Structure 1
Amino acid sequence: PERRQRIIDAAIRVVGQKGIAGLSHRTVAAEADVPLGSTTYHFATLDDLMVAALRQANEGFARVVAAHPALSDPEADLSGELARVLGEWLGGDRTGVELEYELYLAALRRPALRPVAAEWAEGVGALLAARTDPTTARALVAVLDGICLQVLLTDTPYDEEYAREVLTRLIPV
């Protein structure tokens, strides 16, 4: 896009290969192939750069969730919907997908990054709480996290059938 985006994109490509540690304005400038000046002009702190990156990723996810209105439809299959939302991104692309999670975590173990790293759970959690109940909402958010790990931690494909199955055991009747 116009260089600010180019920079955020490169920041991402750098972390997705050298980890947050190998992320500097030099690394980014090189990767985005832009003056060092540009990167600092747009992002004073590396944290500002990180935060921007996560916000982009958060919005990336908050987008697929909005593409599943059924999630808040009381007549829809909730677990089926949640398993689809997962499968929709954990499915396929086991390349850039593995990279997106391998930074969601990296982000999490960072003091000022963690709050934005789990924002996805805020939207989902708020939605499931209104749909079901607080305890069920938290339990659901918990297995979602549990399942992504299981998956993105082995040559283990997704398996919606399994996900919906365990998700369903959590929804009360």
Structure 2
Amino acid sequence: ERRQRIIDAAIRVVGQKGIAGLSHRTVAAEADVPLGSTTYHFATLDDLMVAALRQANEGFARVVAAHPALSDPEADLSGELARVLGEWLGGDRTGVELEYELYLAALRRPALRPVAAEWAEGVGALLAARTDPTTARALVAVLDGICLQVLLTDTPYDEEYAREVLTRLIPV
């Protein structure tokens, strides 16, 4: 209800101000509601942060939801992944940056650990179901390193590189 009107205000405030610009006052302003209602639904910011990311996590589903080849016996997995991956990182990255920002905030924010471990959740499940539970962790580990390389160092996205390295891990 309001948790919603105020949650989208958190993703809008991080996307814009980055975590550092997120405070109850900060979101209460976006959501356009009283300071006491923001504080009500979310006692601490860590809660209003898991809310934010737990909702973001969804988006990843909707995505796999849209591409069938991912759950398809053949197609590929690697080509499909490299492909769709270049999409999410395509052009304006205000979305991925807020998502990664939060997810990585689990480095020093304990409350944010459980949600963080629910990252690839939207594929980590699928991959281990398509392959094994050692290749699942693997693939998500390559994706992370591959995505961190682009976002943190200005290196452009190399889809063939990624489509190339993803295969090596996935056995036959």
CA shift for structure 1 position 3: 4.2
Instruction: Mark the CA change 1:98 to 1:48 in structure 2 (over 3 Å): closer, same or farther.
Output: closer
For the structure 1 residues 79 and 166, does the alpha-carbon distance in structure 2 shift closer, same or farther, using more than 3 Å as the test? same
Answer whether contact 1:107 1:113 (CA < 8 A) is retained.
yes
Residue ranges of structure 1 left out of the alignment (5+ in a row): none
Residues 123 and 33 of structure 1: CA distance in aligned 2, closer, same or farther (over 3 Å) = closer
Shift of 1:161: 1.4
Alignment-derived partner of residue 79 in structure 1: 78
Q: 1:31 to 1:13 in 2, by over 3 A?
A: same
Is 126-135 or 10-19 further displaced after alignment?
A: 10-19
TM-score by length of 2: 0.86
C-alpha separation in 2, matches of 1:98 and 1:156: 15
Instruction: Identify the residue that residue 33 of structure 2 maps to in structure 1.
Output: 34
TM-aligned CA deviation for residue 144 of structure 1: 0.8
Is 1:54 paired with 2:53? yes
Answer yes or no: is the 8 Å Cα contact 2:53–2:99 preserved in 1: no
Assess if the C-alpha contact under 8 Å between 1:11 and 1:53 holds in 2: yes
Residues 139, 166 of structure 2: 8 Å contact kept: yes
Instruction: Check if 1:43 corresponds to 2:36.
Output: no
Contact 1:6 1:32 in 2 (8 A): yes
User: How far is the alpha carbon of 1:94 from its aligned partner?
Assistant: 2.9
Q: Deviations over 1:45-104 (max 9, x none)?
A: 322211110111000112112212221211111101111231221122234433332222
Gaps of 5+ in 2: none
Q: Which segment drifts farther, 145-154 or 82-91? A: 82-91
Supply the distance in 1 between the matched residues of 2:53 and 2:30 (Cα, whole angstroms): 18
Question: How many residues are treated as equivalent by the alignment?
Answer: 172
Determine the C-alpha separation between the residues in 2 that align with 1:163 and 1:109.
Answer: 29
Question: TM-score scaled to structure 1, two decimals?
Answer: 0.86
Separation of aligned partners in 2, 1:8 and 1:117: 18
Name the structure 2 match of 1:169. 168
Instruction: Please tell me whether the aligned partners of residues 16 and 102 of structure 1 are also in contact (alpha carbons under 8 angstroms).
Output: no
Offset of residue 146 of structure 1? 0.8
Secondary structure, counterpart of 2:109 in structure 1: coil
Please, what is the CA RMSD of the aligned residues?
Answer: 2.1
Instruction: Point out the more displaced range, 65-74 or 20-29.
Output: 20-29
Cα distance, 1:23 vs structure 2: 2.7
Moved more, 135-144 or 93-102: 93-102
Alignment partners' CA distance in 1, 2:29 and 2:121: 35
In structure 2, distance between residues paired with 1:54 and 1:72: 25
**Partner of residue 131, structure 1:** 130
Percent identical pairs in the alignment equals 100
